[PDB]
Amino acid sequence: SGFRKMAFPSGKVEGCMVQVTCGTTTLNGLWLDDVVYCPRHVICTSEDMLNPNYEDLLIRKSNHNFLVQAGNVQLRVIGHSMQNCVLKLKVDTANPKTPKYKFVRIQPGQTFSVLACYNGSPSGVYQCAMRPNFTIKGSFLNGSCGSVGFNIDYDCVSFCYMHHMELPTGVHAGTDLEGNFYGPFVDRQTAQAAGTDTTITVNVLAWLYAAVINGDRWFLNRFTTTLNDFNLVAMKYNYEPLTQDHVDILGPLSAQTGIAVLDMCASLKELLQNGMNGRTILGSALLEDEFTPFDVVRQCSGVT
Amino acid sequence: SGFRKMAFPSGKVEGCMVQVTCGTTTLNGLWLDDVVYCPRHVICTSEDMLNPNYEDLLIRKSNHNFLVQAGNVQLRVIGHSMQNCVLKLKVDTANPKTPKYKFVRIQPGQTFSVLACYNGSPSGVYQCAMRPNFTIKGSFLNGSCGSVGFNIDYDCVSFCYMHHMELPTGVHAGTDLEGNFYGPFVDRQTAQAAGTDTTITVNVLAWLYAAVINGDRWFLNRFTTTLNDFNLVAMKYNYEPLTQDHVDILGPLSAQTGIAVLDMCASLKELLQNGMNGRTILGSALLEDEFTPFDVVRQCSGVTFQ
Ligand SMILES: *C(=N)[C@H](C[C@@H]1CCCNC1=O)NC(=O)[C@H](CC1CC1)NC(=O)c1cc2cccc(Cl)c2[nH]1
Ligand SMILES: *C(=N)[C@H](C[C@@H]1CCCNC1=O)NC(=O)[C@H](CC1CC1)NC(=O)c1cc2cccc(Cl)c2[nH]1
């Protein structure tokens, strides 16, 4: 038993992390086959960061303006192109530790593992959710950029995230591995607001199922509700609307516990309306929205 | 910015995890050089587990009663000894991925990373504190035993933990890598009490400093206190007594923030006595005691591993 924020094992991803320097900017790259992927903002001076014409800046740059170190081994940069907000640096060497991999753009509400890196070295691994406003609540310092977010499926790494920036709210923004930002953000040195930070309703419910499987049941009521009655309340508390598809996603958890999604929806409704009175669920005095139904099953059936 | 419960990179440890089977019992072992370390309870049937004579059970076993698989690779067992609550299985092959390693028995209030494994396959990594009552708040299902806890220092792995059991309170118990339990636990199919779960006071304070470095300051007051006045409140809430040594360890976080340890102690005292008024600190509506001062500095300065 027990329920923890669990990251995927980081071994397959550690092997792909390298250092990318350009002038004074150093950050992290992802070395897959003969390509290093890093944030295009590596080519900027502080002057350029304010209103960068990335097209023009990249024209002034040559292969030899990029210093790529993989551990102690310098990689020769033989090519440089720009795909949306990522630089693809062609190197003369295939990463021999390239794991089987995909690039996926994850949907809001989905979680992934972040391997936080400085100077191409892993510091640590933690789990994050792509919030509905397309931000993540991470732990990212200077030089963290190019750190990547990933999921592991069979032997296959799905890279979904590359870190580019911090927002004034202290939350984080980045791209998929094709360089397209999650959400409205631009790679430019400017205070950028995210939307209002709505709560991933289906994740709260999954987590409540995690709670029941681990013996926290005090919030179970004999009440029920309809999807439309639930959504009417939840909207008032900036909860994402719950869809039939979300009910279907929760099915396995619903079956393991014997509680219909709509019975649990009735429980969450009481919790939103009456608060928690300083009781805890799975050790939390707040409602947790960063576990997917998948995260909950992984931990409460034993997938490896 | 941001402060998260962060585990060590698991790459160096992943290569050491294997499957150990004996009769129908399968769990995880740790393969370093030509030795596999697993929980001795791998030799038990359900009929034995309640009052096991491990000495007698192990005598009925031979090298060939142990199946060790590393991924698909069959390891031949050529030796077996019991040290405390671990089996050392001598195998014919040195783990080619053996990282530089130590075995360390960590102190209560110290943290480590747990690589949760089933059938010798790593499922995930999370950070845990050895609590003052020598339990950890983990996530462990059947077959998770032999999962290890570790720290990374430079390129050197310090293995401090091997998972053996759950307690009725829903917390976890295990050994160091020489098979000696943390705390009073025995490897027997029996509901065992941990002590009162005292709070690691030094860690709450470090975490409050982490909060200030990340811009949460609402709990800072004009007040200060003495160690003796603080401990008088702390004791009341089953907080560990704050020692002079703990004040000394908090020095650098105190200096980085410019809040004196006793000013932060004054803040914690107000938080224990008045609660948090339903506000959050680093996204928590409770006080977090599972970050060491060291964890806070590492994460807030951005320290990496070779
Ligand atoms: C990448 N190495 C770096 C990560 C940042 C650094 C600051 C602390 N934490 C992080 O997540 N990204 C970076 O410096 C970016 C580069 C910009 C996108 C082109 N800059 C910012 O994140 C940035 C700029 C501004 C302006 C105003 C307010 C805020 Cl919060 C800003 N963040
Ligand atoms: C190891 N594979 C396994 C891990 C356990 C299994 C149950 C869920 N969580 C875990 O962490 N440990 C295990 O089966 C041990 C084996 C015994 C110690 C030698 N047994 C227990 O954890 C166990 C026995 C009892 C009896 C009463 C109450 C409780 Cl909480 C118990 N836990």
XYZ file of C-alpha atoms and ligand atoms in Angstrom:
674
model
C 0.000 0.000 0.000
C 0.947 3.721 0.052
C 0.613 6.343 -2.695
C 3.592 8.558 -3.756
C 4.400 10.969 -6.612
C 6.549 8.486 -8.586
C 8.790 9.391 -11.554
C 9.736 6.864 -14.259
C 13.233 5.385 -13.883
C 15.556 8.003 -15.509
C 18.294 5.622 -16.814
C 17.328 5.598 -20.533
C 17.050 9.457 -20.590
C 20.284 10.161 -18.576
C 22.279 8.733 -21.525
C 20.789 11.345 -23.934
C 21.595 14.529 -21.939
C 24.452 16.778 -23.185
C 25.668 20.319 -22.716
C 25.048 22.981 -25.435
C 27.022 26.246 -25.224
C 26.797 29.197 -27.596
C 28.685 32.381 -26.612
C 28.031 32.689 -22.823
C 24.682 30.715 -22.794
C 25.058 27.069 -21.673
C 22.023 24.799 -21.346
C 21.015 21.145 -21.892
C 20.404 19.242 -25.152
C 18.766 15.848 -25.973
C 21.060 13.660 -28.094
C 19.108 11.126 -30.129
C 20.793 9.407 -33.081
C 23.011 12.137 -34.708
C 20.778 15.085 -33.604
C 20.905 17.298 -30.517
C 17.592 19.055 -29.649
C 17.830 22.155 -27.425
C 15.934 25.473 -26.998
C 16.644 27.940 -29.843
C 17.064 30.713 -27.172
C 20.640 29.268 -26.658
C 21.720 31.476 -29.635
C 20.596 34.723 -27.864
C 22.594 37.410 -26.003
C 20.570 39.194 -23.201
C 20.100 42.061 -25.771
C 18.543 39.617 -28.298
C 16.209 37.891 -25.754
C 13.843 40.948 -25.556
C 12.621 40.969 -29.216
C 14.572 38.148 -30.911
C 14.343 37.642 -34.714
C 15.384 33.982 -34.376
C 15.464 33.566 -38.205
C 18.089 36.407 -38.435
C 20.047 35.414 -35.284
C 20.486 31.820 -36.528
C 21.838 33.109 -39.939
C 24.742 34.924 -38.039
C 25.625 31.542 -36.380
C 27.910 28.816 -37.779
C 28.305 25.108 -36.814
C 31.494 26.163 -34.850
C 29.432 28.624 -32.666
C 27.922 25.489 -30.958
C 29.986 23.615 -28.310
C 28.299 20.292 -27.514
C 29.849 18.196 -24.755
C 28.546 14.666 -23.904
C 30.162 14.029 -20.533
C 33.815 14.939 -21.321
C 33.508 14.043 -25.078
C 33.109 17.107 -27.389
C 30.594 16.296 -30.234
C 31.359 17.879 -33.669
C 28.385 20.027 -34.870
C 28.162 19.539 -38.677
C 24.639 21.106 -39.116
C 22.101 23.476 -37.448
C 18.403 24.043 -38.275
C 15.401 25.547 -36.444
C 12.079 23.676 -36.022
C 9.571 26.047 -34.305
C 11.341 26.863 -30.958
C 13.979 24.018 -30.995
C 17.428 23.933 -32.593
C 18.313 20.603 -34.250
C 22.162 20.381 -34.140
C 23.343 17.619 -36.516
C 26.431 15.979 -34.930
C 28.943 13.562 -36.586
C 28.178 10.779 -33.986
C 25.002 8.723 -33.284
C 24.357 8.573 -29.523
C 25.082 4.847 -28.912
C 22.735 5.041 -25.861
C 19.793 6.288 -28.042
C 16.841 4.343 -26.542
C 13.698 3.457 -28.528
C 11.755 6.736 -28.419
C 8.771 8.768 -29.716
C 7.909 12.438 -29.591
C 4.331 13.015 -28.305
C 2.478 16.281 -27.592
C 0.612 15.365 -24.338
C -2.954 16.544 -23.625
C -3.633 18.829 -20.629
C -4.261 16.766 -17.448
C -1.573 14.157 -18.467
C 1.532 13.617 -16.243
C 5.175 13.007 -17.135
C 8.601 12.640 -15.463
C 11.020 15.610 -15.622
C 14.800 14.906 -15.562
C 16.133 18.264 -14.203
C 19.657 18.896 -15.662
C 22.437 21.501 -15.339
C 25.393 21.521 -17.793
C 24.130 18.296 -19.384
C 24.128 16.442 -15.994
C 20.991 15.047 -14.279
C 20.319 16.546 -10.784
C 16.981 14.787 -10.185
C 13.703 13.326 -11.391
C 10.140 14.310 -10.318
C 6.641 13.936 -11.786
C 4.664 16.888 -13.286
C 1.182 17.353 -14.808
C 0.528 19.443 -17.916
C -2.013 21.764 -16.232
C -5.113 22.869 -18.201
C -3.499 26.342 -18.667
C -0.450 24.537 -20.217
C 1.969 25.292 -17.328
C 3.802 22.808 -15.063
C 4.767 23.243 -11.356
C 8.421 22.190 -11.634
C 11.792 22.941 -10.020
C 13.953 24.731 -12.556
C 16.950 27.101 -12.024
C 19.201 28.934 -14.495
C 20.791 26.536 -17.011
C 17.839 24.067 -16.526
C 16.510 24.737 -20.049
C 16.533 21.760 -22.436
C 15.747 19.495 -19.461
C 13.112 17.022 -20.832
C 9.794 15.499 -19.741
C 9.015 11.895 -20.648
C 6.886 8.742 -20.084
C 8.091 5.125 -20.523
C 5.840 2.555 -22.329
C 7.203 -1.013 -22.796
C 10.916 -0.196 -23.580
C 9.897 3.036 -25.454
C 10.518 6.584 -24.147
C 7.822 9.142 -25.236
C 9.492 12.621 -24.918
C 6.664 15.160 -24.485
C 8.372 18.200 -22.923
C 11.446 20.419 -23.196
C 11.850 23.215 -20.611
C 12.146 26.829 -21.896
C 10.893 29.298 -19.304
C 9.555 30.386 -15.925
C 6.435 32.599 -15.710
C 5.920 35.376 -13.116
C 3.540 33.016 -11.169
C 6.623 30.737 -10.458
C 5.267 28.015 -12.830
C 6.996 26.643 -15.947
C 6.441 26.520 -19.729
C 8.052 24.558 -22.531
C 7.614 22.918 -25.903
C 7.044 19.446 -27.256
C 10.121 17.938 -28.949
C 9.051 19.550 -32.304
C 9.466 23.011 -30.672
C 5.745 23.955 -30.419
C 5.042 25.558 -27.020
C 2.368 24.179 -24.773
C -0.048 27.111 -24.364
C 0.320 30.739 -25.569
C 3.966 31.267 -24.510
C 6.771 32.721 -26.666
C 10.541 32.253 -26.108
C 11.117 35.973 -25.459
C 12.228 37.760 -22.255
C 8.853 39.086 -21.176
C 6.455 38.502 -18.255
C 3.751 36.202 -19.765
C 0.529 35.291 -17.940
C -0.954 31.750 -18.127
C -4.747 31.393 -17.990
C -6.603 30.888 -14.716
C -5.257 27.561 -13.325
C -8.336 25.270 -13.518
C -8.253 21.935 -11.564
C -8.074 18.593 -13.502
C -11.362 17.100 -12.144
C -10.771 13.538 -13.527
C -7.339 13.534 -11.689
C -8.954 14.569 -8.332
C -11.393 11.698 -8.765
C -8.602 9.167 -9.609
C -6.751 10.340 -6.500
C -9.900 9.846 -4.379
C -10.018 6.272 -5.765
C -6.282 5.971 -4.763
C -7.448 7.135 -1.275
C -10.168 4.425 -1.036
C -7.801 1.645 -2.200
C -5.378 2.839 0.570
C -8.199 2.804 3.263
C -9.149 6.616 3.436
C -13.014 6.383 3.092
C -14.362 9.145 5.409
C -15.484 11.269 2.381
C -17.639 8.478 0.840
C -21.359 9.420 1.144
C -24.424 7.341 0.144
C -25.333 10.282 -2.237
C -25.251 10.188 -6.000
C -25.508 12.838 -8.763
C -25.621 13.189 -12.592
C -22.700 14.449 -14.780
C -24.660 17.681 -15.458
C -25.430 18.323 -11.730
C -21.720 17.699 -10.834
C -20.333 19.930 -13.662
C -22.722 22.756 -12.500
C -21.017 22.824 -9.028
C -17.437 22.037 -10.220
C -17.483 24.901 -12.812
C -18.159 27.245 -9.811
C -14.799 26.038 -8.241
C -12.745 26.301 -11.517
C -12.831 22.502 -11.936
C -12.576 21.219 -15.566
C -15.875 19.765 -16.749
C -16.130 15.969 -16.425
C -17.026 14.179 -19.730
C -18.466 10.676 -20.339
C -15.002 9.760 -21.747
C -13.429 10.681 -18.304
C -16.048 8.454 -16.576
C -14.992 5.636 -18.982
C -11.226 6.361 -18.170
C -12.057 5.992 -14.405
C -13.889 2.682 -15.027
C -11.141 0.279 -13.804
C -10.655 2.310 -10.560
C -14.498 2.412 -10.202
C -14.592 -1.443 -10.559
C -11.599 -2.133 -8.216
C -13.333 -0.049 -5.465
C -16.970 -0.917 -6.372
C -17.861 2.862 -6.345
C -19.484 4.285 -9.535
C -17.770 7.449 -10.851
C -21.070 9.279 -10.155
C -21.052 8.154 -6.454
C -17.445 9.475 -6.199
C -18.536 12.680 -8.081
C -21.187 13.038 -5.274
C -18.308 12.633 -2.725
C -16.143 15.320 -4.497
C -19.210 17.708 -4.626
C -19.520 17.455 -0.735
C -15.736 18.096 -0.441
C -15.885 21.213 -2.727
C -19.018 22.611 -0.889
C -18.082 21.758 2.777
C -14.240 21.808 2.437
C -12.231 19.121 4.307
C -12.405 20.565 7.903
C -8.577 19.985 8.129
C -8.891 16.165 7.706
C -6.395 14.606 5.283
C -6.781 12.308 2.271
C -3.640 10.247 1.474
C -1.693 12.602 3.826
C -2.920 15.765 1.954
C -4.918 18.679 3.448
C -5.773 19.751 -0.161
C -7.318 17.962 -3.188
C -4.571 16.597 -5.505
C -5.148 16.945 -9.305
C -1.701 15.748 -10.585
C -2.392 11.987 -10.578
C -3.948 10.545 -13.783
C -6.179 7.488 -13.603
C -3.152 5.732 -15.225
C -0.782 6.880 -12.387
C -3.282 5.511 -9.833
C -3.625 2.081 -11.524
C 0.250 1.795 -12.011
C 0.692 2.214 -8.242
C -2.465 0.255 -7.131
C -1.948 -2.923 -9.360
C 1.892 -2.909 -9.715
C 2.929 -2.080 -13.390
C 6.785 -1.957 -13.908
C 12.334 28.638 -8.985
C 10.033 25.871 -7.660
C 10.639 23.327 -4.915
C 9.681 19.673 -5.607
C 10.238 16.312 -3.837
C 13.033 15.184 -6.237
C 14.632 11.712 -6.412
C 18.211 10.994 -7.520
C 18.736 9.914 -11.124
C 18.068 6.101 -11.004
C 20.343 5.105 -13.963
C 23.298 3.728 -11.956
C 20.913 1.680 -9.687
C 18.578 0.324 -12.477
C 21.449 -1.859 -13.773
C 21.771 -3.610 -10.372
C 18.159 -4.848 -10.040
C 17.413 -8.559 -10.668
C 14.698 -11.083 -9.966
C 15.186 -13.690 -7.174
C 12.812 -16.688 -7.086
C 12.758 -19.507 -4.546
C 9.900 -22.046 -4.826
C 6.868 -19.821 -5.698
C 8.211 -16.615 -3.928
C 9.685 -14.040 -6.358
C 11.120 -10.684 -5.255
C 13.921 -8.249 -6.187
C 17.659 -8.514 -5.503
C 20.604 -6.091 -5.748
C 23.451 -7.363 -7.946
C 26.843 -5.840 -7.131
C 30.034 -7.554 -8.338
C 29.261 -11.344 -8.058
C 26.822 -11.011 -5.126
C 23.041 -10.698 -5.114
C 21.482 -9.178 -1.948
C 17.789 -9.904 -1.328
C 15.473 -10.284 1.730
C 15.933 -13.648 3.445
C 12.100 -14.031 3.572
C 12.405 -15.178 -0.144
C 12.960 -18.704 1.331
C 9.545 -18.752 3.192
C 6.197 -20.353 2.195
C 2.937 -18.783 3.627
C 2.864 -21.735 6.128
C 6.389 -20.654 7.439
C 6.053 -16.820 7.438
C 4.265 -16.434 10.833
C 7.060 -17.889 13.034
C 9.987 -18.573 10.647
C 13.185 -20.329 11.871
C 15.259 -18.768 9.057
C 18.366 -20.763 10.094
C 16.433 -24.080 9.618
C 14.593 -22.952 6.455
C 17.870 -21.916 4.775
C 19.459 -25.362 5.567
C 16.680 -27.080 3.460
C 17.746 -24.862 0.461
C 20.635 -25.461 -2.004
C 22.259 -23.031 -4.524
C 19.920 -24.546 -7.231
C 16.768 -23.575 -5.178
C 17.511 -19.912 -6.163
C 16.598 -18.696 -9.707
C 18.206 -15.323 -10.405
C 17.324 -13.533 -13.616
C 18.862 -10.134 -14.610
C 16.437 -9.076 -17.363
C 16.535 -12.253 -19.535
C 20.070 -13.253 -18.294
C 20.008 -16.382 -16.057
C 22.659 -15.933 -13.279
C 24.028 -19.252 -11.916
C 23.937 -19.349 -8.067
C 27.233 -20.926 -6.809
C 26.900 -19.820 -3.085
C 24.381 -18.615 -0.443
C 24.859 -17.142 3.033
C 22.525 -15.362 5.457
C 23.761 -12.051 7.013
C 21.118 -10.760 9.478
C 17.922 -10.452 7.370
C 19.610 -10.539 3.864
C 20.688 -13.453 1.700
C 24.018 -12.964 -0.089
C 23.726 -15.196 -3.245
C 27.180 -15.685 -4.837
C 26.660 -15.816 -8.626
C 29.157 -16.910 -11.361
C 29.014 -13.448 -13.085
C 30.133 -9.973 -11.914
C 27.437 -7.391 -12.720
C 29.197 -5.455 -15.524
C 27.079 -2.400 -14.504
C 28.247 -2.451 -10.823
C 28.558 1.306 -10.070
C 30.995 2.723 -7.485
C 29.062 2.037 -4.248
C 29.094 2.071 -0.416
C 26.695 0.583 2.054
C 25.650 3.197 4.659
C 23.155 2.914 7.550
C 21.468 6.382 7.321
C 20.489 8.335 10.454
C 16.829 9.119 11.301
C 15.808 12.431 9.605
C 18.036 11.713 6.532
C 16.409 11.260 3.074
C 17.130 8.830 0.208
C 15.622 7.809 -3.185
C 13.609 4.530 -3.461
C 13.713 2.637 -6.822
C 10.424 0.652 -6.582
C 10.833 -2.697 -8.476
C 8.602 -5.687 -9.324
C 10.153 -8.913 -10.756
C 13.570 -7.188 -10.900
C 12.190 -4.386 -13.146
C 12.229 -0.764 -11.926
C 8.682 0.803 -11.952
C 9.530 4.215 -10.445
C 11.586 6.497 -8.224
C 10.518 8.704 -5.260
C 12.298 10.341 -2.293
C 11.782 9.089 1.308
C 12.961 10.145 4.776
C 14.043 7.680 7.430
C 11.508 8.927 10.029
C 12.548 9.194 13.714
C 10.578 5.938 14.407
C 12.602 4.226 11.594
C 9.685 3.869 9.141
C 9.363 5.361 5.645
C 6.174 6.631 3.890
C 6.576 4.699 0.641
C 4.467 3.024 -2.033
C 5.077 -0.714 -2.044
C 2.884 -3.616 -3.311
C 3.459 -7.382 -3.107
C 6.781 -8.368 -4.747
C 8.253 -4.869 -4.056
C 10.617 -6.396 -1.446
C 14.326 -6.061 -2.254
C 13.608 -2.653 -3.802
C 16.512 -0.388 -2.597
C 16.938 3.126 -1.222
C 20.032 5.113 -2.091
C 21.875 8.449 -2.284
C 24.250 9.518 -5.057
C 27.460 11.427 -4.148
C 29.651 12.392 -7.149
C 29.373 9.074 -9.108
C 29.264 6.924 -5.838
C 25.970 5.220 -4.858
C 25.395 4.899 -1.068
C 22.817 2.042 -0.649
C 21.081 2.634 2.661
C 17.760 0.747 2.382
C 16.223 -2.560 1.280
C 12.432 -2.984 1.512
C 11.020 -5.904 3.616
C 7.588 -5.015 5.039
C 4.498 -2.899 5.595
C 3.242 -2.026 9.123
C -0.456 -1.820 10.069
C -0.165 2.044 10.080
C 0.427 1.853 6.249
C 4.141 2.795 6.617
C 7.207 0.771 5.554
C 10.193 -0.965 7.182
C 13.418 -2.394 5.837
C 17.073 -3.087 6.482
C 20.391 -1.559 5.555
C 22.329 -3.597 2.963
C 23.908 -5.755 5.767
C 20.400 -6.956 6.666
C 19.956 -5.072 9.990
C 16.486 -3.545 10.251
C 16.026 0.138 10.824
C 14.080 0.287 14.112
C 12.613 -2.638 16.135
C 11.132 -4.643 13.237
C 11.480 -8.411 12.572
C 10.867 -10.130 9.189
C 7.869 -12.226 10.388
C 4.175 -12.182 9.195
C 3.030 -10.151 12.186
C 1.489 -6.708 12.784
C 4.333 -4.640 14.399
C 4.038 -1.171 15.968
C 6.439 1.684 15.066
C 6.881 4.295 17.819
C 5.055 7.595 18.011
C 5.902 9.305 14.651
C 7.778 12.406 15.864
C 8.293 15.213 13.264
C 11.872 16.008 12.038
C 11.910 19.644 13.312
C 15.212 20.543 11.537
C 13.640 19.431 8.187
C 10.423 21.531 8.729
C 12.669 24.538 9.315
C 14.824 23.787 6.180
C 11.605 23.495 4.155
C 10.362 26.852 5.532
C 13.680 28.307 4.315
C 13.025 26.597 0.920
C 9.610 28.422 0.998
C 11.330 31.824 1.607
C 13.895 31.236 -1.194
C 10.871 30.517 -3.483
C 8.984 33.736 -2.371
C 6.465 32.316 0.283
C 7.068 34.704 3.300
C 3.555 35.176 4.799
C 4.480 33.165 7.956
C 7.529 35.325 8.819
C 6.679 37.402 11.984
C 8.367 40.274 13.892
C 8.907 37.797 16.826
C 11.951 35.727 17.809
C 12.390 33.006 20.519
C 15.030 30.911 22.417
C 15.762 27.179 21.751
C 14.216 26.352 25.185
C 10.990 28.361 24.515
C 10.652 26.736 21.028
C 11.245 23.148 22.301
C 8.522 23.766 25.001
C 5.915 24.186 22.178
C 7.560 21.586 19.799
C 7.450 18.812 22.433
C 3.667 19.489 22.822
C 3.161 18.620 19.050
C 5.560 15.576 18.967
C 8.248 17.591 17.197
C 11.867 16.341 17.763
C 13.689 18.687 20.142
C 15.748 21.243 18.208
C 19.419 20.984 19.310
C 22.258 23.514 18.996
C 23.741 21.159 16.277
C 20.467 21.566 14.253
C 20.811 25.393 14.597
C 24.413 25.025 13.278
C 23.219 22.879 10.271
C 20.537 25.545 9.416
C 23.185 28.312 9.418
C 23.759 28.505 5.607
C 19.968 28.549 4.803
C 19.609 31.242 7.568
C 22.454 33.274 5.926
C 21.241 32.813 2.299
C 17.729 34.089 3.332
C 18.864 36.605 6.050
C 16.292 35.102 8.543
C 17.958 34.018 11.847
C 17.267 30.381 12.819
C 15.500 31.603 15.989
C 13.307 34.026 13.863
C 12.256 30.996 11.729
C 11.791 28.927 14.952
C 9.469 31.820 16.112
C 7.600 31.454 12.769
C 7.265 27.604 13.182
C 6.041 28.048 16.827
C 3.215 30.424 15.568
C 2.392 27.873 12.808
C 2.127 24.944 15.317
C -0.030 27.041 17.796
C -2.294 28.978 15.306
C -2.292 26.447 12.401
C -1.925 27.785 8.831
C -5.416 29.410 8.492
C -5.913 27.183 5.344
C -3.043 28.931 3.451
C -0.303 26.922 1.742
C 3.508 26.904 1.915
C 5.149 25.627 -1.317
C 1.686 24.259 -2.275
C 1.277 22.300 1.032
C -1.490 22.836 3.647
C 0.697 20.885 6.126
C 4.304 21.315 7.354
C 6.719 19.073 5.336
C 9.520 17.306 7.362
C 11.092 15.109 4.576
C 13.615 17.657 3.180
C 17.017 17.899 4.912
C 18.859 21.223 4.968
C 21.192 19.521 2.441
C 18.253 18.618 0.128
C 17.131 22.283 0.191
C 20.591 23.696 -0.676
C 21.246 21.050 -3.452
C 17.893 21.807 -5.132
C 18.055 25.636 -4.687
C 21.673 25.820 -6.119
C 21.102 23.115 -8.838
C 23.686 20.364 -7.960
C 24.165 17.581 -10.649
C 25.610 13.968 -10.700
C 28.533 12.536 -12.842
C 16.467 28.160 -19.193
N 17.684 27.812 -18.978
C 15.757 29.217 -18.384
C 14.994 28.542 -17.251
C 14.422 29.580 -16.283
C 15.467 30.538 -15.709
C 14.879 31.397 -14.600
C 14.435 30.491 -13.482
N 13.791 29.275 -13.967
C 13.584 28.925 -15.226
O 12.713 28.113 -15.551
N 14.873 30.006 -19.231
C 15.013 31.321 -19.386
O 15.908 31.960 -18.870
C 13.980 32.037 -20.247
C 14.538 32.281 -21.642
C 13.501 33.045 -22.411
C 12.421 32.291 -23.117
C 13.462 33.025 -23.907
N 13.567 33.282 -19.626
C 12.616 33.275 -18.677
O 12.174 32.216 -18.227
C 12.007 34.549 -18.297
C 12.006 35.816 -18.819
C 11.127 36.575 -18.000
C 10.706 37.916 -17.990
C 9.830 38.345 -17.010
C 9.341 37.481 -16.038
C 9.743 36.160 -16.038
Cl 9.150 35.060 -14.859
C 10.623 35.706 -17.009
N 11.157 34.481 -17.222
C 7.642 -7.857 0.216
N 7.636 -8.328 -0.975
C 6.359 -7.502 0.956
C 5.979 -6.037 0.743
C 4.677 -5.752 1.481
C 3.495 -6.618 1.010
C 2.146 -6.118 1.508
C 1.955 -4.722 0.984
N 3.147 -3.890 1.165
C 4.394 -4.283 1.412
O 5.333 -3.488 1.563
N 6.437 -7.746 2.393
C 5.812 -8.760 2.974
O 5.076 -9.533 2.370
C 6.184 -8.995 4.436
C 6.955 -10.299 4.542
C 7.239 -10.559 5.983
C 8.061 -9.571 6.748
C 8.619 -10.925 6.426
N 5.006 -9.029 5.280
C 4.327 -7.913 5.614
O 4.637 -6.795 5.215
C 3.275 -8.036 6.610
C 2.812 -9.021 7.428
C 1.835 -8.410 8.252
C 1.003 -8.883 9.271
C 0.129 -8.016 9.867
C 0.065 -6.687 9.513
C 0.884 -6.182 8.532
Cl 0.802 -4.501 8.134
C 1.776 -7.043 7.903
N 2.672 -6.842 6.908
